[PDB]
Design an enzyme around this catalytic site. Structure first.
Site, short mmCIF file in Angstrom:
data_model
loop_
_atom_site.label_atom_id
_atom_site.label_comp_id
_atom_site.label_asym_id
_atom_site.label_seq_id
_atom_site.Cartn_x
_atom_site.Cartn_y
_atom_site.Cartn_z
N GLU A 62 9.53 26.66 20.53
CA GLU A 62 10.24 27.32 19.52
C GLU A 62 11.75 27.69 20.05
O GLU A 62 11.54 28.22 21.39
CB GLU A 62 9.64 28.39 18.98
CG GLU A 62 8.50 28.07 17.87
CD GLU A 62 9.28 27.11 16.48
OE1 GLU A 62 10.62 27.62 16.37
OE2 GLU A 62 8.58 27.03 15.88
N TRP A 63 12.78 27.76 19.73
CA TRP A 63 14.03 28.08 20.22
C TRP A 63 14.09 29.40 20.71
O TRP A 63 14.87 29.43 21.61
CB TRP A 63 15.21 28.03 18.82
CG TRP A 63 14.75 29.09 17.71
CD1 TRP A 63 13.70 29.09 16.95
CD2 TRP A 63 15.41 30.44 17.77
NE1 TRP A 63 13.78 30.36 16.19
CE2 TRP A 63 14.52 31.28 16.67
CE3 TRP A 63 16.39 30.80 18.33
CZ2 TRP A 63 14.89 32.51 16.51
CZ3 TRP A 63 16.60 32.43 18.09
CH2 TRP A 63 15.98 32.99 17.02
N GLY A 83 -1.08 23.46 24.34
CA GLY A 83 -1.71 22.67 23.54
C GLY A 83 -1.86 22.98 22.01
O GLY A 83 -0.73 23.22 21.37
N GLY A 84 -2.93 23.09 21.34
CA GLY A 84 -3.18 23.30 20.10
C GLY A 84 -3.21 22.06 19.32
O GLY A 84 -3.40 20.92 19.92
N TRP A 85 -3.61 22.21 17.99
CA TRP A 85 -4.03 21.06 17.11
C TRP A 85 -2.79 20.20 17.15
O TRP A 85 -3.00 18.77 17.28
CB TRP A 85 -4.52 21.30 15.80
CG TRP A 85 -4.86 20.33 14.98
CD1 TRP A 85 -4.23 19.57 13.94
CD2 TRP A 85 -6.11 19.59 15.08
NE1 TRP A 85 -4.78 18.54 13.53
CE2 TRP A 85 -6.25 18.62 14.01
CE3 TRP A 85 -7.34 19.38 15.99
CZ2 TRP A 85 -7.21 17.53 13.99
CZ3 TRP A 85 -8.40 18.79 15.72
CH2 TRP A 85 -8.23 17.62 14.79
N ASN A 86 -1.59 20.52 16.54
CA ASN A 86 -0.46 19.93 16.28
C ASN A 86 -0.20 18.85 17.62
O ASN A 86 0.33 17.71 17.29
CB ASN A 86 0.52 20.68 15.83
CG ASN A 86 0.59 21.14 14.22
OD1 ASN A 86 1.12 21.91 13.96
ND2 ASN A 86 -0.66 20.84 13.72
N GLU A 100 -6.97 19.87 22.58
CA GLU A 100 -7.93 19.43 21.31
C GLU A 100 -7.88 18.21 20.98
O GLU A 100 -7.31 17.68 20.12
CB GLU A 100 -7.42 20.28 20.23
CG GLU A 100 -7.50 21.90 20.44
CD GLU A 100 -7.04 22.47 19.15
OE1 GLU A 100 -7.30 22.13 17.93
OE2 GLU A 100 -6.66 23.77 19.31
N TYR A 101 -8.78 17.53 21.62
CA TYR A 101 -9.77 17.79 22.82
C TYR A 101 -10.09 16.71 23.86
O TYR A 101 -9.92 15.48 23.33
CB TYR A 101 -11.34 18.23 22.39
CG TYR A 101 -11.37 19.32 21.17
CD1 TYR A 101 -10.96 18.91 19.59
CD2 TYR A 101 -11.26 20.78 21.36
CE1 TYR A 101 -10.70 19.86 18.73
CE2 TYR A 101 -11.32 21.68 20.39
CZ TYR A 101 -11.09 21.26 19.04
OH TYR A 101 -10.85 22.29 18.15
N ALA A 123 -15.69 30.09 17.64
CA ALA A 123 -16.80 30.13 16.68
C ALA A 123 -16.32 30.27 15.44
O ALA A 123 -16.77 31.34 14.82
CB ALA A 123 -17.84 31.22 17.25
#
Length: 365
Positions: A49-50, A76-79, A119-120, A190
């Site tokens: 992010e800027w 990371g993260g999903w996107n 992920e993952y 979880a």
């Protein structure tokens, strides 16, 4: 006991009252704050992010008012996807490039560690060979952090990882016993056990299975998720139980059948602020007038419905129950996704600031 809380990079774009920036954090609410998410450019840790540089300073600046607070940056993260992780860990040269940049990056912005949110490994396009390479990544980071501590004279950088609950994902990419040794702590996701991706109503994060649930299905719950990570080698003191400050919604096939496991035509109407079907923030759920809230006796978690909308979520009681559970299991503490999804400014649930997370803070001590 730890209270690990996730801050999200994009919550700053939520509109009106839901907008969330570092100024909205409570520096004593949690023991560890994890900034999500950082990206990767040419095998190097990078912003997404800027204004991450400005926000990083604000984020870690909180440590001046509470020296005990520990912060980590989550990559990371999903996107983000798997490819960049995949190519980076394929060679010792790129891994070293990534490790060295992480060290410089973290120390540069004053982060206390790195949280791995790939992920993952072994899934979502990631080759099964990534299972062992992930272990090797974890080890390299651990070794490097070990050495950097003596060369800098600062506290050894922390290393953690956000991990999936599902047996499929866990078997495909995690050498639990091997990585647990090297990770300072493990953030167990979880939640997301049930969702609008299923044609039948189900809870986002139930503690136990339903009495009429069996087979694979009887594994879709917190308790089963915790036992799996413990049984596979994770020492209880390092397993941090993740809890959701959000719920998952469905559009009912009929407003006439609101039972758990009832027919669902699709994701629930997206929230005014979160703007994503199938999901709602806790501050959006408690903002429901003329609804009917009921608890699932077997699973210890609530759900509400109104017209053709059905959402299973967590509340003060459910959180209290899970903390009680967490203690019985002797875990290391609780984790939360996410800070901006709880009513952080008491603008909706009329339960004060951080109703859910403050509950975790009170119970954990």
């Amino acid at each position: 006991a730890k209270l690990v809380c996730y801050f999200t990079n994009w919550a700053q774009y939520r509109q009106g009252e839901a907008r969330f920036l570092p100024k909205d954090l409570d520096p004593s609410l949690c023991t560890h704050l994890i900034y999500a998410f950082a990206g990767m450019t040419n095998h190097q840790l990078s912003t997404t992010e800027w204004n991450d540089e400005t926000l990083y300073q604000e984020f870690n600046g909180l440590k001046k008012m509470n020296p005990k607070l520990k912060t980590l940056l989550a990559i990371g993260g999903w996107n983000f996807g798997t490819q960049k992780f995949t190519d980076m860990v394929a060679t010792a040269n790129n891994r070293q490039t990534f490790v060295n940049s992480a060290i410089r990056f973290l120390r540069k912005y004053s982060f206390d560690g790195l949280d791995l949110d790939w992920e993952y490994p072994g899934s979502q396009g990631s080759p099964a060979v990534d299972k062992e390479r992930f272990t090797t990544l974890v080890q390299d980071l651990a070794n490097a952090f070990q050495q950097e501590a003596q060369t800098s004279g600062k506290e050894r950088l922390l290393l953690s990882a956000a991990v999936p609950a599902g047996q499929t994902y866990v078997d495909a990419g995690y050498e639990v016993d091997k990585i647990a040794q090297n990770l300072d702590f493990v953030n167990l996701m979880a939640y997301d056990f049930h969702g609008s991706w299923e044609k039948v109503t189900g809870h986002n994060s139930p503690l136990y299975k339903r009495q009429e649930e069996s087979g694979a299905a009887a594994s879709l719950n917190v308790d089963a998720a915790v036992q799996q990570w413990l049984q596979k080698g994770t020492p209880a003191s390092k397993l941090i139980l993740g809890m959701p400050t959000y719920g998952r919604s469905f559009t009912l096939a009929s407003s006439s059948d609101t039972r758990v496991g009832a027919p669902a035509t699709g994701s629930g109407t997206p929230g005014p602020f979160t703007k994503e079907g199938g999901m709602l923030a806790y501050y959006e759920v408690c903002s429901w007038k003329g609804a009917t809230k009921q608890r699932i006796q077997d699973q210890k978690v609530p759900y509400i419905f109104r017209d053709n909308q059905w959402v299973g979520f967590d509340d003060v009681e459910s959180f209290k129950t899970k903390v009680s559970y967490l203690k019985q299991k002797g875990l290391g503490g609780a984790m939360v996704w996410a800070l901006d999804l709880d009513d952080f400014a008491g603008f909706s649930c009329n339960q004060g600031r951080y109703p859910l997370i403050q509950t975790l803070r009170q119970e954990l001590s």
